Design a protein around this ligand. Structure first.
Ligand SMILES: Nc1nc2c(ncn2[C@@H]2O[C@H](COP(=O)(O)OP(=O)(O)O)[C@@H](O)[C@H]2O)c(=O)[nH]1
Length: 290
């Protein structure tokens, strides 16, 4: 868990920019469930045109077709997007491959100038909980000061044939300013922190599922709900079917909310991408010119 406050943010920006000076390529790690909303709002100013591999992690918990629309988006920005499952170790060899492609022009011009070939230096950057330390551990094939009061120095990890990876990720803050992004981040568990009401997060999640995977929602909770019912009827049908009740047969809404949030966060109902590309056209247009 990370506590953001202005000074911590300024320190994070400073330190990540500094680390970025030591590398050839940056791996921006995002959640495949929200490839756009799980980005740091200042990521392009921090990265500052450094060759970029965008890694869509937790692909196992998302929708591939939707992810492909985001990959196309990143491609159009001049980045090299790849999707992985860092936890279950699926598709990792493509990280090095992507790095080689992203830095190919730099190293071609070095070879033209008569410089010796050399290992690619990379670092991973992203918001909390997108899977940075998981990915680093997996790429090192080992868990990455162990005496109290002894300070860890940053080190390079040999990865594959061509890649040196900084063993310490740059950690940046999530988008804060927008309430729908707040809900998306809470639904993926990127922020398990207050000042976004859980009941509203649960409502958002349920509505997402009603619109995009209604049969699955119903079969998962084994419920059937009138299509003209308001969202409260969904909380009630779930609560009643699961016996989440209190004070006779009133619905324990806190418990229903927690169950819905848990099931969406842990992909118990399905594998969804909550950044719907075609619904985010205006947001993308606003963010773009910068
Ligand atoms: N299902 C799944 N879980 C993942 C993946 N990468 C990380 N996780 C899990 O997501 C949580 C956050 O991972 P973590 O590496 O600590 O994120 P970090 O804050 O960016 O270093 C952990 O519980 C991981 O086990 C993935 O690719 N698939």
């Amino acid at each position: 868990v990370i506590q953001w406050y202005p000074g911590h943010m300024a320190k994070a920006k400073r330190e990540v920019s500094e680390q970025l000076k030591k590398v050839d390529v940056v791996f921006e790690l995002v959640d495949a469930r929200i490839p756009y909303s799980s980005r740091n709002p200042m990521i392009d100013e921090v990265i500052n045109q450094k060759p970029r591999v965008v890694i869509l992690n937790k692909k196992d918990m998302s929708n591939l077709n939707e992810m492909s629309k985001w990959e196309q988006f990143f491609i159009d920005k001049g980045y090299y997007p790849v999707s992985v499952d860092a936890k279950h170790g699926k598709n990792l060899k493509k990280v090095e491959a992507a790095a080689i492609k992203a830095t190919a022009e730099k190293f071609e011009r070095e070879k033209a100038k008569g410089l010796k070939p050399r290992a690619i230096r990379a670092m991973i950057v992203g918001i909390p909980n997108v899977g940075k330390s998981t990915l680093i551990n997996k790429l090192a094939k080992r868990s990455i000061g162990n005496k109290p009061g002894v300070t860890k120095q940053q080190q390079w990890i040999k990865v594959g044939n061509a890649l040196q990876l900084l063993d310490t990720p740059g950690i940046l803050w999530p988008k804060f300013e927008d309430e729908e992004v707040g809900k998306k981040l809470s639904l993926t568990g990127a922020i398990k922190d207050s000042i976004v009401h859980l009941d509203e997060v649960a409502i958002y999640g349920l509505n997402f599922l009603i619109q995009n995977d209604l049969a699955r929602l119903k079969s998962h909770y084994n419920i059937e709900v009138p299509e003209d019912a308001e969202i409260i009827a969904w909380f009630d049908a779930i609560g009643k079917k699961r016996g989440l009740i209190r004070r006779g047969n009133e619905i324990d809404y806190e418990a229903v909310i927690e169950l819905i949030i848990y099931d969406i966060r842990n992909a118990k109902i399905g594998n969804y991408c909550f950044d719907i590309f075609k619904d985010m056209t205006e947001e993308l247009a606003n963010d773009a010119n910068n």
